[PDB]
Amino acid sequence: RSYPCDEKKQSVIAECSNRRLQEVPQTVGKYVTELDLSDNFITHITNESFQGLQNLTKINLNHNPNGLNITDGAFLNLKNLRELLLEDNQLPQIPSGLPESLTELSLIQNNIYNITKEGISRLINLKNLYLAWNCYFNKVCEKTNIEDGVFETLTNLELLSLSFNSLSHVPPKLPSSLRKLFLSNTQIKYISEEDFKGLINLTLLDLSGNCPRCFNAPFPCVPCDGGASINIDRFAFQNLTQLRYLNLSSTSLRKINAAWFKNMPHLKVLDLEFNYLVGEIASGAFLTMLPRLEILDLSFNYIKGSYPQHINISRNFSKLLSLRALHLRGYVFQELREDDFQPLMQLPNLSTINLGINFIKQIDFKLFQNFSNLEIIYLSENRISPDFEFDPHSNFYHFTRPLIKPQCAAYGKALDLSLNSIFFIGPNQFENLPDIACLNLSANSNAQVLSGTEFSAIPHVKYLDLTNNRLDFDNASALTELSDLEVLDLSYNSHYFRIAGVTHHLEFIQNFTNLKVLNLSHNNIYTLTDKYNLESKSLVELVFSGNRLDILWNDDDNRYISIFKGLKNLTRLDLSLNRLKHIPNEAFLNLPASLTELHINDNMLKFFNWTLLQQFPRLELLDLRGNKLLFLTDSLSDFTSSLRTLLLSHNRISHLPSGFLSEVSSLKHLDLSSNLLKTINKSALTKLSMLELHGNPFECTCDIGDFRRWMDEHLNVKIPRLVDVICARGKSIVS
Amino acid sequence: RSYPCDEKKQSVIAECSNRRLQEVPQTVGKYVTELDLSDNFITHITNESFQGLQNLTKINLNHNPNGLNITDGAFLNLKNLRELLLEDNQLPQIPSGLPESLTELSLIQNNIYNITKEGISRLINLKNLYLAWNCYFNKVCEKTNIEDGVFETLTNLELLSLSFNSLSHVPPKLPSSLRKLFLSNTQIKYISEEDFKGLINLTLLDLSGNCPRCFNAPFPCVPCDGGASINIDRFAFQNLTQLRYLNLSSTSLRKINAAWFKNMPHLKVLDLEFNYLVGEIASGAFLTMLPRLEILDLSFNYIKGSYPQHINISRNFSKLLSLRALHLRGYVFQELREDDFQPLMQLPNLSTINLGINFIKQIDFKLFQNFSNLEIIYLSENRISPDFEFDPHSNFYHFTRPLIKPQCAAYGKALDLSLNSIFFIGPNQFENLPDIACLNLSANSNAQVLSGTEFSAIPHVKYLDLTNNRLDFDNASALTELSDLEVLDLSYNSHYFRIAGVTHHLEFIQNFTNLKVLNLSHNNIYTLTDKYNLESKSLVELVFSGNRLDILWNDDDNRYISIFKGLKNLTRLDLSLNRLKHIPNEAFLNLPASLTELHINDNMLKFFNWTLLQQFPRLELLDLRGNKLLFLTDSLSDFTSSLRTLLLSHNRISHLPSGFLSEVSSLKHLDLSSNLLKTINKSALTKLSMLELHGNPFECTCDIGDFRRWMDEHLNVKIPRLVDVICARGKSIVS
Ligand SMILES: *[C@@H]1O[C@H](CO)[C@@H](O[C@@H]2O[C@H](CO)[C@@H](O[C@@H]3O[C@H](CO[C@H]4O[C@H](CO)[C@@H](O)[C@H](O)[C@@H]4O)[C@@H](O)[C@H](O[C@H]4O[C@H](CO)[C@@H](O)[C@H](O)[C@@H]4O)[C@@H]3O)[C@H](O)[C@H]2NC(C)=O)[C@H](O)[C@H]1NC(C)=O
Ligand SMILES: *[C@@H]1O[C@H](CO)[C@@H](O[C@@H]2O[C@H](CO)[C@@H](O[C@@H]3O[C@H](CO[C@H]4O[C@H](CO)[C@@H](O)[C@H](O)[C@@H]4O)[C@@H](O)[C@H](O[C@H]4O[C@H](CO)[C@@H](O)[C@H](O)[C@@H]4O)[C@@H]3O)[C@H](O)[C@H]2NC(C)=O)[C@H](O)[C@H]1NC(C)=O
Ligand SMILES: *[C@@H]1O[C@H](CO)[C@@H](O[C@@H]2O[C@H](CO)[C@@H](O[C@@H]3O[C@H](CO)[C@@H](O)[C@H](O)[C@@H]3O)[C@H](O)[C@H]2NC(C)=O)[C@H](O)[C@H]1NC(C)=O
Ligand SMILES: *[C@@H]1O[C@H](CO)[C@@H](O[C@@H]2O[C@H](CO)[C@@H](O[C@@H]3O[C@H](CO)[C@@H](O)[C@H](O)[C@@H]3O)[C@H](O)[C@H]2NC(C)=O)[C@H](O)[C@H]1NC(C)=O
Ligand SMILES: *[C@@H]1O[C@H](CO)[C@@H](O[C@@H]2O[C@H](CO)[C@@H](O)[C@H](O)[C@H]2NC(C)=O)[C@H](O)[C@H]1NC(C)=O
Ligand SMILES: *[C@@H]1O[C@H](CO)[C@@H](O[C@@H]2O[C@H](CO)[C@@H](O)[C@H](O)[C@H]2NC(C)=O)[C@H](O)[C@H]1NC(C)=O
Ligand SMILES: CCCCCc1cc2c(Cc3cccc(CN)c3)cccc2nc1N
Ligand SMILES: CCCCCc1cc2c(Cc3cccc(CN)c3)cccc2nc1N
Numbered sequence A, B: 001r002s003y004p005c006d007e008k009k010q011s012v013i014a015e016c017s018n019r020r021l022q023e024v025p026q027t028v029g030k031y032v033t034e035l036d037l038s039d040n041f042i043t044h045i046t047n048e049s050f051q052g053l054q055n056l057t058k059i060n061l062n063h064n065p066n067g068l069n070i071t072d073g074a075f076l077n078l079k080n081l082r083e084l085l086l087e088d089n090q091l092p093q094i095p096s097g098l099p100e101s102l103t104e105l106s107l108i109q110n111n112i113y114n115i116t117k118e119g120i121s122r123l124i125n126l127k128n129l130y131l132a133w134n135c136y137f138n139k140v141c142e143k144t145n146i147e148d149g150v151f152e153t154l155t156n157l158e159l160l161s162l163s164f165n166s167l168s169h170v171p172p173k174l175p176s177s178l179r180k181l182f183l184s185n186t187q188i189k190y191i192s193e194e195d196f197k198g199l200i201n202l203t204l205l206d207l208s209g210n211c212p213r214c215f216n217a218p219f220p221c222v223p224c225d226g227g228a229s230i231n232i233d234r235f236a237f238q239n240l241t242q243l244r245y246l247n248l249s250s251t252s253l254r255k256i257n258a259a260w261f262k263n264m265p266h267l268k269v270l271d272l273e274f275n276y277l278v279g280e281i282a283s284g285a286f287l288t289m290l291p292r293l294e295i296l297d298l299s300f301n302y303i304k305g306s307y308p309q310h311i312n313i314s315r316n317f318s319k320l321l322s323l324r325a326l327h328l329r330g331y332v333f334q335e336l337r338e339d340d341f342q343p344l345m346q347l348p349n350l351s352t353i354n355l356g357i358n359f360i361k362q363i364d365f366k367l368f369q370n371f372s373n374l375e376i377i378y379l380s381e382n383r384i385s386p387d388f389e390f391d392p393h394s395n396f397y398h399f400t401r402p403l404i405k406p407q408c409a410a411y412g413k414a415l416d417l418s419l420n421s422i423f424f425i426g427p428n429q430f431e432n433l434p435d436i437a438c439l440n441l442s443a444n445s446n447a448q449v450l451s452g453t454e455f456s457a458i459p460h461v462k463y464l465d466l467t468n469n470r471l472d473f474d475n476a477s478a479l480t481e482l483s484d485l486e487v488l489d490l491s492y493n494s495h496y497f498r499i500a501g502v503t504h505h506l507e508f509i510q511n512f513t514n515l516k517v518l519n520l521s522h523n524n525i526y527t528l529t530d531k532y533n534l535e536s537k538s539l540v541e542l543v544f545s546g547n548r549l550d551i552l553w554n555d556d557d558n559r560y561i562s563i564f565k566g567l568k569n570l571t572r573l574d575l576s577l578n579r580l581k582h583i584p585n586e587a588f589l590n591l592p593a594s595l596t597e598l599h600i601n602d603n604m605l606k607f608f609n610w611t612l613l614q615q616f617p618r619l620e621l622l623d624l625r626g627n628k629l630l631f632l633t634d635s636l637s638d639f640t641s642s643l644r645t646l647l648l649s650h651n652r653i654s655h656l657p658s659g660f661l662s663e664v665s666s667l668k669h670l671d672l673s674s675n676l677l678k679t680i681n682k683s684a685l686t687k688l689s690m691l692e693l694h695g696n697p698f699e700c701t702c703d704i705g706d707f708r709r710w711m712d713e714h715l716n717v718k719i720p721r722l723v724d725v726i727c728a729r730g731k732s733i734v735s
């Protein structure tokens, strides 16, 4: 048992993050290799901080403290130190006399404005150097002075990142080992012919945000004089036969010179977001130069004040033969006509069209059929009708998450129409579409009574998202045309559920032979009409959080006592956030005997009838976190032989009953963190692999001794975050 | 300083609620008259519980414990006990040998099924007897046995309530002192001629929920055989000349006998909700019998399965000359035509029409003009387009809150169109309406760009509610036609605010010469377009909670540093729930010097620059509750002479600086509850009238003595909830 860090073996990692450590710990294990020490209160670092920690081949001192004084060659005597990370430390300078064994260095988010030979040129083994985000936006900081030639000694340098600094030009004397060159938001107007001419290995070049398009910028944005475009010499990308990824986002471009790509036969990803390329899109020769392009991002190229009827796509798109994804958000146009996308329809691997945020009013949906294999049709957010703000380690111009949830997209062809205005699905709404498997109609202000016919044209939908609408559930055949339905997400439709005098019919649930997952969360359900029960022979997982079981299962009311019992296959049930003070025993007994996993967290339970766990012989996880439980049973082993994980954090448990750890033979994980345990008696003292105790007011006196021994006896019981397992006054119990 | 209760003088009241008291306190003040002891853990009551507490003319033992054993005549020796309340106690019986001085008795929500002479007939001074809600719904309980004549001795009985018990008929031998008779939900099929014949003083009769209409009931509901109507003898309400309030809600009525009202010339409020009176509404003679009726509730009289084109209102409504409010929710019809309301238009005092929840599709709005003086036009929730569930002390069939917010209605003529489907305000949307002053368009899925013309037909709107829509704020003249605008509520319009690449224009705020109150809460505002500042010469109050000032006022960004300074008249600002870790001093200094009241609660502030309170010389209230403040300044008196209230609960303050209580000469209220104060030194020890300290881990040892003296010295400093001012282990500090 280590302290204050928590170790593992991936290759031996001392996770020592966030522990409020005030200086590097003396007490680290001697087989430790990677020591993560971020987010601590470390203020000073000397040579004698890592005195005897050898074969540390990684250090992380990010965010210290939560500015860091590092003496010169304080790391020098670590002859194995390879990866060093000292991001976000208000470092004034690249620290002096670093150990030349370093292969990866990260100085992101400091105050370093001077890149000197005295810090960098000795370090011949740098592969990846991260200096981004040191002088940017309206930060008080100085122009970035780069001593001449200071990189040419770094002949094993593969990745260099200087983004979000004021450079003004591409440094000269760049080693030709570079494969990845990041110069975004560096205030560079002009790209000369000599600028990259000897970088024959570059796979990636990022010149984004130089001469930026600043209208409506969510950050302080300085245009180039006259909102002028970036100036790229005609032979600037000569000799760059190995480029794969080119990012020219936000460089105010209006013209693309087709000859820029003459010597890039492999170009794979092109990013031209936030430029002014509406003209280039309609008639663009540069598109005939890219037969291996896979991803083209042309988002936010809208003309301010301009709302064209149709989008205008050059015939030249037809030539983009390897194109996989095409992103055209923020073009802004009223209508998508069948003719408008002819140039894309013969492209064989075009699987993703992104038309998000174009305020489109009508789509002639039949057009998506005439394509080859579209997989993701992304139309969200249109107008179709019946420390620190910016993360230095992600992409700055867009979100990188997938457009459509993987779990939904994995079923097949996907149509995301979320955040539109289809407030009512008419009879011909889905005429002429391909066989959609994944459908998002979230947030379309839909208030209709679904009745069994609305989806007849796409009857093979397998995952359906109708979250965040206002469905009026007043017809028992709703959605039953979707015989293949497997996932149905009905969250955040509380509008009509909340009104007691409108009708609520959920009977339809039973008709689905293949329904696996049903989410009814945040619907404020407390009254149903005519039928009180949920029935399905298939359903595996019901999410019923953010409803009102406190009302449903009121003591004076019997109507909903078997609400969930007809769910004969159910293995996971989420009853969290139901305002439950107590569950009547009979209603608890009528939960499906099939359950393996039951969540009743974040209610207000004062009591739990443990005895009833006898009728749930398959149950593996019981989650009661965030209630008001006062007492644990003394006889748990008598009610279950199945429970593997029991979660009880954020309750009011002050005493552990006899044999509680030893006697339950299937139980491996027990979470008692953040309760009211003053102690743990020797009488409470085996099949347990993890026990959580942080957050408790452990009275530290001579009485607390017995348990310590037990910890020493059982190393096989991980006890996390021992630093937070604390005497009630501050020291850990392990002192 | 009392303990454990907290006293006052209204006439001397010992508020002793909710204190976890385990028995009646010995230590009550001897001038105490009313002793509220509800919501405690009281289990037993004997004669020797109130030994020497005389001139107690009120006791409240509701919800004890949080069932109560009361010995016989345990209250007998209180010769002044007047009002006794023992609701919600699982009492098995009316307690025996109660003191005959009682004028008001409340036994609501117990288990009393036997109403005996041994408990009630002696008590000749009962005015008001509450026995409601003892056997109801699916509770395990017995039919209510009422010993014969047991009320006729109570000749000073004015109010009797037996609702929500199984009676089966109106008890006989009811004293003719009764003015108010509550028999709701008592399972009484038949009302005989003899039933009330000698009750010549009744002002109110409630026979609601006997033979109930049970379709879609939000409670276990037992129809009378055949869903039959209640049977009311033709001369059942003979001799009841003094009736004012008649409640016949949910008695399955289909016919009203006009002659029931022959001898009620004063009838004021008639409640016929949840019956089947569509026929009676269209052709109803009973309406010619009620020329003093003021309030008529005909809600939820819908025919299941039926959706008429027009509502059908008998000509006889024209005869309801004193009618003030008419409620017609849940009739359910498609269209309101001008002709359909002719019978109401000459009624002089008709100020309120309620058409909520009728799924109406079109209204011919010009019709509201032809009325006399309509004040509240309530149309919410239609389809217009471009312990314990039930509170025993409120009305069971409807919510009693006002239809329209008083603050909005106080400006004049009100139109509530909330929860409809006016997703777009067209040019003629508001043609032909009266001069609306108060307008609710909440929750209409409105996504348009308001532009300055939409309200031109009702330009004198003074309070405007557009909450819970999705407004696209992309035009600087939005709402500017409303030159008289005084209150503008823009909460919960985050849809477009949250998207960084759409435009956000709030410039319009400045054009309003009369804008007092602006709510921008829960809009997730973090980026504006072109103009970064909020400007108004009039605005008094800005609510900016649930936005992202953490982003706006990011350290690397200057654009929003004066966001609020142009609000030159501002006296109240709410910056709560902005995720603020810290406020740059310059942005804090640019808050309006006019401010008297500033809320920054529920953020995550680690530090507060108190020194800056020097530039806010009018500031009376500073609310920093629910942050992470570690330290208080030692020199507050140097930065302010205006602060009257300072609220610091839920922070991490462990020490009180010298002179903190004494030195600030304007400060009257200081809230330090729920921090981390182990003590309060004698050096921290005048103009203070209230100091809050409950929730702190006060170390109770010899050191804690000094402060106790100070408390004894200053009785003029209310310290609430001393019971919760607790040694860190359980006893109060005042022990
Ligand atoms: C202009 O356009 C270019 C070209 O697309 C963008 O280039 C990408 O830049 C992003 C952001 O810097 C890079 O993203 C990060 O890559 C790191 C390295 O990942 C590679 O190697 C690791 C193995 O070490 C693999 O696991 C991984 O699959 C990759 O093959 C990652 O470490 C980062 O992820 C980590 O941090 C993020 C922080 O958000 C966490 O969310 C993750 O969980 C993880 O811990 C991150 O993914 C990206 O690699 C660049 N692309 C290429 C091909 O090199 C530019 O950023 C863009 N410019 C601007 C300013 O927007
Ligand atoms: C059938 O229809 C009838 C006729 O309308 C309804 O009759 C009303 O019933 C309600 C609920 O019982 C009564 O409401 C309660 O009245 C109490 C007495 O208030 C009068 O006197 C006090 C002075 O003591 C005045 O302050 C007050 O203005 C009244 O003149 C109040 O004490 C109750 O309010 C208190 O408790 C509620 C609990 O919700 C709190 O919210 C309040 O803050 C307050 O503490 C309450 O208002 C009402 O008075 C009856 N009307 C008349 C004219 O007598 C029936 O209820 C209805 N039947 C059913 C089953 O719905
Ligand atoms: C409605 O509830 C459903 C069902 O629970 C929610 O979908 C599920 O969400 C969880 C995460 O919350 C997904 O599990 C996760 O999977 C990822 C990827 O494998 C993994 O990395 C995580 O550790 C976790 O296991 C789960 O796959 C997903 N299930 C389905 C069928 O999509 C849904 O999010 C809820 N809807 C709303 C609006 O809250
Ligand atoms: C948007 O913010 C406004 C302005 O603050 C909110 O309206 C105000 O709400 C408060 C209560 O939250 C009202 O004060 C209260 O008045 C009543 C009656 O006098 C009193 O009993 C209370 O003690 C309290 O003082 C205030 O009058 C009201 N102001 C106006 C102009 O209506 C509004 O509720 C917010 N909107 C949303 C949707 O949250
Ligand atoms: C349906 O569309 C909605 C809206 O685009 C998606 O909701 C987003 O999902 C992510 C991941 O949880 C959240 O972080 C965002 O907050 C959500 N956006 C909004 C506006 O709520 C949803 O995931 C889509 N559904 C599917 C199946 O892919
Ligand atoms: C505008 O209409 C909405 C919806 O009817 C009103 O919102 C309700 O107000 C009450 C009082 O705060 C809340 O308890 C309800 O939760 C609200 N309902 C909903 C659906 O949110 C609103 O008050 C009306 N505005 C005015 C000025 O009267
Ligand atoms: C992609 C972001 C475009 C931002 C501007 C913006 C454009 C909008 C449009 C398109 C449009 C662009 C330019 C001019 C016009 C005509 N006013 C419309 C339609 C509907 C709502 C519109 N709302 C907005 N906020
Ligand atoms: C006042 C509550 C009425 C409850 C029934 C109910 C009625 C609705 C109506 C009216 C209606 C009533 C009776 C029959 C019909 C025709 N299906 C419509 C229109 C639109 C949505 C409707 N949604 C509902 N849930």
Ligand SMILES: *[C@@H]1O[C@H](CO)[C@@H](O)[C@H](O)[C@H]1NC(C)=O
Pocket (backbone or CB within 6 Å): A197, A198, A238, A239, A263
């Ligand atoms: C760049 O390419 C051109 C022709 O493609 C060639 O003449 C020149 O030698 C190359 N430059 C370098 C430095 O390789």
Ligand SMILES: *[C@@H]1O[C@H](CO)[C@@H](O)[C@H](O)[C@H]1NC(C)=O
Pocket (backbone or CB within 6 Å): A321, A322, A323, A348, A349
């Ligand atoms: C499309 O991708 C497939 C593999 O998914 C590949 O075999 C094929 O060569 C690609 N076609 C083109 C024209 O790039």
Ligand SMILES: *[C@@H]1O[C@H](CO)[C@@H](O)[C@H](O)[C@H]1NC(C)=O
Pocket (backbone or CB within 6 Å): A451, A452, A474, A475, A476, A477
């Ligand atoms: C559902 O709606 C369909 C289509 O109008 C209708 O025929 C059917 O009657 C409805 N079902 C029920 C159970 O009301």
Ligand SMILES: *[C@@H]1O[C@H](CO)[C@@H](O)[C@H](O)[C@H]1NC(C)=O
Pocket (backbone or CB within 6 Å): A452, A477, A480, A510, A511
């Ligand atoms: C749904 O299931 C019920 C009962 O199993 C059946 O009566 C009903 O007709 C079904 N509806 C459809 C459309 O399959």
Ligand SMILES: *[C@@H]1O[C@H](CO)[C@@H](O)[C@H](O)[C@H]1NC(C)=O
Pocket (backbone or CB within 6 Å): A513, A516, A537, A538, A539, A540, A569
């Ligand atoms: C029960 O669930 C399993 C696992 O999802 C599934 O294979 C089976 O079909 C379901 N049973 C029924 C009767 O639908």
Ligand SMILES: *[C@@H]1O[C@H](CO)[C@@H](O)[C@H](O)[C@H]1NC(C)=O
Pocket (backbone or CB within 6 Å): A585, A586, A589, A609, A610, A611, A612
């Ligand atoms: C648990 O519920 C059962 C009935 O299912 C009851 O007999 C038993 O007394 C309850 N146990 C506790 C501790 O409440």
Ligand SMILES: *[C@@H]1O[C@H](CO)[C@@H](O)[C@H](O)[C@H]1NC(C)=O
Pocket (backbone or CB within 6 Å): B197, B198, B238, B239, B263
């Ligand atoms: C009731 O009224 C009728 C006539 O209105 C009268 O004859 C009778 O005496 C009255 N009954 C009582 C008991 O007052």
Ligand SMILES: *[C@@H]1O[C@H](CO)[C@@H](O)[C@H](O)[C@H]1NC(C)=O
Pocket (backbone or CB within 6 Å): B321, B322, B323, B348, B349
């Ligand atoms: C209407 O109410 C007013 C007082 O607001 C009263 O003077 C008048 O008599 C009432 N009219 C009728 C017909 O009741």
Ligand SMILES: *[C@@H]1O[C@H](CO)[C@@H](O)[C@H](O)[C@H]1NC(C)=O
Pocket (backbone or CB within 6 Å): B451, B452, B474, B475, B476, B477
């Ligand atoms: C607001 O909309 C009006 C009406 O179309 C238009 O004339 C005006 O140009 C718009 N204002 C701005 C500032 O765009």
Ligand SMILES: *[C@@H]1O[C@H](CO)[C@@H](O)[C@H](O)[C@H]1NC(C)=O
Pocket (backbone or CB within 6 Å): B452, B477, B480, B510, B511
């Ligand atoms: C609003 O105010 C601004 C500046 O005070 C002015 O230029 C603009 O024309 C105003 N618009 C209207 C409709 O009053």
Ligand SMILES: *[C@@H]1O[C@H](CO)[C@@H](O)[C@H](O)[C@H]1NC(C)=O
Pocket (backbone or CB within 6 Å): B513, B516, B537, B538, B539, B540, B569
């Ligand atoms: C400032 O507020 C006060 C109080 O609401 C108001 O009387 C005055 O008109 C406002 N001042 C201006 C310049 O609008």
Ligand SMILES: *[C@@H]1O[C@H](CO)[C@@H](O)[C@H](O)[C@H]1NC(C)=O
Pocket (backbone or CB within 6 Å): B585, B586, B589, B609, B610, B611, B612
């Ligand atoms: C408060 O802000 C002022 C600048 O307005 C600065 O001079 C001072 O140092 C700050 N005080 C603290 C305690 O941060």
